[model samples]
Target: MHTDGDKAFVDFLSDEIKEERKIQKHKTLPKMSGGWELELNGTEAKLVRKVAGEKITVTFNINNSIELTSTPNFVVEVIKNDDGKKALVLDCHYPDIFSIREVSFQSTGESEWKDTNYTLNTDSLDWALYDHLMDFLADRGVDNTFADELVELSTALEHQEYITFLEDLKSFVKSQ
Candidate 1:
């Protein structure tokens, strides 16, 4: 029993290390002057880039906290302000973190180029759901596949299937 517990602890730490490495390496900004111009401003604590309905995500460490930003094509809703100002906000958040945050974009001449805001969640994630999701993937013969793709997706955030898989996985886990 002691040995099993030790193994589990080691495995958990290993997974965390892997996640940290992935977050450090992932880049979401598009190539500069290559159709989409990418800009990173550390002073502002934001990275700006042009996106053409392509999913973009960036993960990095700052001020001892992990920051994740993603812009997917999934538009949750469009809102018009009282002053007739229109904007689009989408559901965005860190995977494995069970809180939904909003990334809003204001209408510019380009339309596709919009600024995204990073909002922190008050509650912590549901680890139990993540555990069940791992089991679910294993049962589907895609054990760790979601885990691997999540890292890749976190970098580019362009894969539609990744979002779909997560949505379906959440539904399946909840249904069971």
Candidate 2:
């Protein structure tokens, strides 16, 4: 079930809602209103105005509509690029449940954690590989858990290489 604010986002933001509370890496905090403030470990979290097709796109999928009250959320910032690629800041964050799948950037506009657009040719991730990775997760009961660690190994271009590694193994997952 969505909160009042989430409904508002769907009513208003539509595609710009960062992440509702029902995706794989959903955040549990209440849907932050515009210009609100949150302090986490000396870090301030505030809502800022943004434009869709310009900033980011957030999507959420609940675990169970009838049995579960809360679900996870996935946030992926549309990466900025001169290449005109439609990449994203994909990330998942859930306690105890797996919280990684694609690459992400915490600091905006920095090369340190910045990853290019995910591509099949670049990262060697494809439908076959994705199915295999999902099977592994399913075997590990990730489907039964709060969220998936692999998050269904999908890709676009920038993180294609990262996607390849993620589906492989830990040693291979981080190997550039």
Candidate 3:
């Protein structure tokens, strides 16, 4: 179910992530003492740094998506130099069913939120991997809900079915 738009959107994100990494490599990010303030779409939010020294944490807001009809107001915590390593963690905050009113049905009325972590090694940032991952997700019967939403995590499907999808993705990546 990979549309032409999906491919373009994946490429856009992959490029954006790579560019962000490049900027970080060349310049030092601003340090946060108490809280780092950020504004998105006229909405103000605070990115709090919970950990001490050298571990910088900031919230990245996803303003819009080109592939989905309506993108979720998702935020991810970007951690620099996580655990004294040359790696960053993308802590994605997946909203609860109620908070994600638009896609509540997809969650099957779940009450709690979930976090999806992606650890990117700064030493070897392969932008192509993101493109491949998106393609693999689509191959596993996952696609955008509308023309800008992300690939749907099917709640209607059986538990094992979801596990199989994950396993298939892992297999696909391993083969690549």
Which structure among the candidates has the greatest TM-score?
2
1 or 3, greater by lDDT: 1
Model 1 Cα lDDT, one tens digit per residue, 1-176:
23555555556655554555455544453332223223334311222223333223222222222245332212223333332344433343344422234444545223464545443222444666545543532343223442243334333433332334444444443341
Candidate 1 ranges with C-alpha deviation above 4 Å: 1-35, 43-84, 96-99, 103-176
In the range 1-176, model 3's lDDT, one tens digit per residue, is 55666556556655554554454344332333334333333222334433434433332333332112222344232233333433222323233121111111112122444333243432354556645533432332222321122212111112223334444554443341
In model 1, residue pairs whose N, Cα or C atoms come closer than 3 Å (at least 3 residues apart or on different chains), thus clashing, are: none
Per-residue lDDT tens digits for candidate 2, residues 95-158, read 4453435543345544455335442331344567555544543343333332432232111111
When 1 and 2 are scored with TM-score, the better candidate is 2
Give per-model TM-scores.
Answer: 0.23, 0.26, 0.21
The model with the greater TM-score, 2 or 3, is 2
RMSD values for the candidates in order, in angstroms, are: 18.4, 20.4, 21.2
Q: What does the lDDT read for residue 104 in candidate 1? A: 43
Q: Which stretches of candidate 2 lie over 4 Å from their true place?
A: 1-31, 35-54, 63-69, 81-84, 96-99, 104-176
Give me candidate 3's TM-score against the actual structure: 0.21
The per-model lDDT (C-alpha) reads: 0.36, 0.36, 0.33
lDDT of 1: 0.36
The global Cα lDDT (0 to 1) of model 2 is 0.36
